[model samples]
Target: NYTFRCLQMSSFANRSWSRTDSVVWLGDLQTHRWSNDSATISFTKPWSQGKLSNQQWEKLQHMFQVYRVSFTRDIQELVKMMSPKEDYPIEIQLSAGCEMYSESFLHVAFQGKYVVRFWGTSWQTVPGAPSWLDLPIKVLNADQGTSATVQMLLNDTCPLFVRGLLEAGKSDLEKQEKPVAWLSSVHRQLVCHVSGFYPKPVWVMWMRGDQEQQGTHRGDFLPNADETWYLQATLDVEAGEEAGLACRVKHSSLGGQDIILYW
Candidate 1:
């Protein structure tokens, strides 16, 4: 019941798995690594500190056996495409979801650049895959088996994540701070840099003494590494008008309060 073009792809991109080469210990059986490869993984509950009981090691070997047969060759092909002088780095992921309503994609990045992608059963490959990969990818795309799997995921899995997303959004909503506004002049034009505030939605206006002044004010709220937001507003004023110029910031965190800053 969905058109291919309408299928939206959702992806996990960036250094969430491993920001650096150091091995990150994330409790029992969960670890992250970055070097010639980047990965995040969790095994059965009992494994820890790179140590596993004899039985657990045996089970782990069996898991690798299946993975080797199923996905290793494809990954190697993608890696070989880089044709680097040395072994760079790569990250391989297996993700599951649906179509339209939800979807997840597996991404392979080599030396910080994506080289291969797998969405559902459709293989979106790079040149590293053998020249013959094209026909096989086309075949996978036409198979209805993946459609059934996608439908199953939509019915059974999507709602669980939807709830998690809602909860995270609510938790991230926090009390806001009044933006720190300062005035500067660039090439005779007055500019105001408003920085360090939370909650993206805010109102910034230019004021001349006691009245709101309108001419040309610009800039958008941009995010900072700390998850706070900031913006800028500008106005053109005559030399004598600088003393009367001010910037007013209206935001929810102010509790119906407006903070006005003067030159």
Candidate 2:
């Protein structure tokens, strides 16, 4: 399983490929949910026997790019939806195939722009758009062998937030709340597990804010028999002080992206 980069898809509402509407919508973004269930790489290139005509290829290419973007957005939404590094899902399916497909990306990397109107709040925007928001995007990969059984391997290599971002509410709904959880944490051990291969070289680092307490910490990690990695950590902290935490996981072979959790 490998990760593929997600692209920005401006035209999603209508398509000429299939009349069934194969697009996956996340909030306002429409993309495909990458999953091991039915996403298979197709040999539709000009050099392949199953290639499509220029007209068909153009449409198909658009759909494929849309799928990739949608899948990445879905995974990122999952991470943000399950904030605090406590309720996050270990494995996520960006695009879940409705029926069956022969050609899909084996691995992908997702890229997107974001905006931070204030502290502790964020929003995803169209790619290439400039914004002040800074948070690492979620990148995921799955292993598919051109068969019915698909195995999903998940890990995070990017940092969603940096140090000094307080958990303040930015929206009318969020204003009622106080602190939000980061993608990963270091003050406390944030662990992850998936259905397949272990994510090698676990990463948990103390950011700039926790410089005083670095000497007294301990952690442990091991690869699970399934297809994911396991990690754990512990850092001493006072109850009311301004302490931050972040955890990062990497799977270079599966697209080599980072899944970040910070607070």
Candidate 3:
């Protein structure tokens, strides 16, 4: 279970929901803004971009810095690390018109075994509707090491997406090229978008037919800011076995449930 302690419990308090009409009216107000069809995103891996010379890459590395700070005893430290300096400011204009017919929520899923803080506009709506930013709170001391799979109902037809931005650090791009795989001989590939918060672990493995196949293959995890980790790997399925895919995640903290997706 998660506990939430709101420092500024105004309209953006702990738990609440807004009306559909309210959200739709918001959409109407922002009709001049870019519609979903009009928005074109040239999707690319965050860790990779640009054609850099060797010297340029070295200079880039020196300029970028990051720390894998924990969320527990380091809340103040992480807050300080992420906090904008007095001289400079970190500005994020996150205004969007969302529509929901059924019950829905605006949440900020905080992962990692750490505590953190930041000063920004939480998920607070206008006066007509209620606004509650879901940044759950929990005791760092009474923490139990487990995993959970969080699933919410998507009543709408369109895909739901949450957006945020984080600057790069530690040159994850320097060795961005794919590493040599041991199963390159088998030459089979498996790709998936198993996305979620990191330090929040997940499992990606292969199965041959209905029976479970023991995997000698290990996987790699990459983080795309916001504490979320991206998992990717390729595997060689036995020639005669039924090739199947699985994504298993442990969500012991949120609840005692595992997210298993087989296709």
Candidate 4:
């Protein structure tokens, strides 16, 4: 079966969606694990009536077909330069994925260490590789030409395959009017919750009046159904007699403003 997955370069949360998530298939291929231990797989497709439309499916099939042949040959060539005296069996791993909004990249690793990574028009190599393995001028130029072209194929064309579907679910992506902050006691320690925010990369902290309070921060910035985000920070001590206890949130979307909430 054909497969597809999206990796957000900006978002780190590992949440999945149901019904409206983006799966276009019925079930997952049991053999698609990276290293075992049940994985989180989704069936979201780039389109409705199937994960891909007629054109998108055809192109994706082509991508797999082309990559399989080229990837095999490239690996074979790289392996030939390895030292025959190594004690352990040589290992090679290759991965190809696209950045939805920022960049498109390809990576190749040998013996658990990343050896080469190509992004946009440039490529890099790690130190463990053979000395003769150099990024030649001709090869660099050739890659520069192809990388730009490939990026367009992945970012521009591939994304449109799911554009209509994503926009169709726009209502499910909502932004909160403001952050909600509350204090609750967990295990006798006072914890602060600052949630219901959007467009992540938010910073949350506890402030004791003018001084920044410190505590063991827990939880993470998580996603909401509407593509919004939320996170929580905790302060361990009781604020019963404390005059000033507030949660300060900083996010780029907030511009020069900081959302400060007191309890």
Candidate 5:
């Protein structure tokens, strides 16, 4: 699967929308970002490796320009439909993508909710969606030529694009960075912060002997400036229990060697 996503915050007062757009492949691989003037490509090996042709880039850029304008106009129309209050703190997201689980399935979404989908050369609105989405659906279904163009793009190039991306990105994606544990005690609580781990999934817990300690609570994962992730695990215990307790970090980055820190 390959998706192009745009995150936008709308300000009615200024009639301006602040937005950042990027292309993502598979789960978390970001291949491109859009600026005011151009789309910046990442991991160019796809074209070089023969998985994608050079001609695809120019067509993609033009389509991205179309998507940008189309999305902004649609958001303005939706806001008009709602008659939102001034300075209403409105935000929206757009995701358009293709999935190959079928011969081809193409879809477009607003605010992460899939309102419009295309398959078998037909555009459809999922049942139970709000009436406000009617316009976008109607507009898409009316334009068979454009739909067929996009559908063909997805069917022909999307899978090949993903294949090349995966092959090129595997080294970076699979690379690992072990966590560095930092321990601190504050307000009668032991906080063990595990930082700088790759791939995000990690486990940090308070342990005693062979048993997992009670009151071990883990915090949400946070991203580092360098793209790694960090998280903290805490255990509530008094002065005596601290003697035998330990903070253990388990992560794939550690290569099965979990780190243990004791007071």
Candidate 6:
């Protein structure tokens, strides 16, 4: 079974003057943001702008404002209750999201040295949260309005959002661009270049006939202008008796065929 999830990853920085500058990710994509100084929300992904109807989007945006203000306000109480002196910077990280299977599930987690989390209407402490949040979790759980609203968001709207994204971004998510492979040698290094592939998951390596090259060094995937991907695999060679030295590229888009290039 495929479990589709929408994750909102947020980091809150409590400066000497306390405000929030949070970036949020939906699944693996950077999707939303809220700057500390403003009452506005920004969409990082183009698809997000058109994913839902205008009315739905506006209401959802307002919900974020409600959540943001609540988090910011309550944090001040926690800071004072936990610390006698206001420190340099207190960083709070939160992951709030849902997963869709046969049934849907939701979780909210606050992270630091330990974890104070809300899972299915219950609050628990984990390794990533702090003890300071103990009071806040109880207070939050007792809030009927807040808890009800969040449950509606994650249980209903969140899964719908995930489905909408799946359909709206179908082309880009499923599209595959066959990687072009080339070779270049410099500083006793034979570099195998693979460029223009989509969906990101790919395997490239240096091979000598049927055996994998032990010296093959793979670099991080780089982005292309078209939003595909680029990667390079290198082998340190003395350039002496270099025979059967080939670059092999493996990707699902290749239709079970591996692209091989001899240097």
Q: What TM-score does candidate 2 get on C-alpha atoms?
A: 0.22
Question: In candidate 5, how many Å is residue 32 off?
Answer: 1.5
Put down candidate 4 lDDT per residue, 5-40, tens digits, no spaces: 332111111122111111221111111222112123
- Give the alpha carbon lDDT tens digit for every residue of 1-263 in model 2: 21122322322121222111233321122223323233433331122212235565456456555655554465455545545552322322123221111122222112322321111121233354433222332122121221212221111111111000111111211121111113333433432222222334434444434343353343444545432444444444444443354444344433555544454
TM agreement with the true structure for every prediction: 0.52, 0.22, 0.25, 0.47, 0.74, 0.77
- Clash totals for all models, in order? 0, 44, 12, 11, 0, 4
lDDT for each of the candidates? 0.51, 0.31, 0.29, 0.49, 0.65, 0.70
The best-first sequence of candidates by lDDT reads 6, 5, 1, 4, 2, 3
Estimate candidate 1's alpha-carbon lDDT, on a 0 to 1 scale: 0.51
Which window of 10 residues has the lowest lDDT sum in candidate 6? 1-10
Candidate 6 per-residue lDDT, tens place, 1-263, comes to 22444344434455346665666554445566777766877876667654688888888888878877777667766666767653335656555555545355544554444366556666566554545556667877888887677667666776778777767766655677889889997537888899988768899988888899888999998988776789998888765756778899999889999999987
- What residue runs in model 3 are displaced by over 4 Å at the alpha carbon? 1-187, 208-212, 243-245
Best by TM-score: 6
Off by over 4 Å in 5: 1-20, 23-26, 37-50, 70-92, 98-120, 126-128, 153-156
Among all candidates shown, the one with the greatest lDDT: 6
Candidate 2 vs candidate 3, TM-score winner: 3
**Model 6: residues >4 Å from true position, as ranges?**
1-16, 24-27, 49-51, 99-114, 127-129, 184-189, 214-219, 222-226, 236-239, 253-258
2 or 6, which is superior by lDDT? 6
User: Order of candidates by TM-score, top first?
Assistant: 6, 5, 1, 4, 3, 2
Q: Give all candidate RMSDs, comma-separated.
A: 10.1, 22.3, 20.4, 10.2, 4.5, 3.7
In candidate 5, what are the lDDT values of residues 82-117, reduced to their tens digit? 665423344444454544432445555545566666
Where does the lowest 10-residue lDDT sum fall in candidate 5? 4-13
Winner on TM-score between 2 and 5 is 5
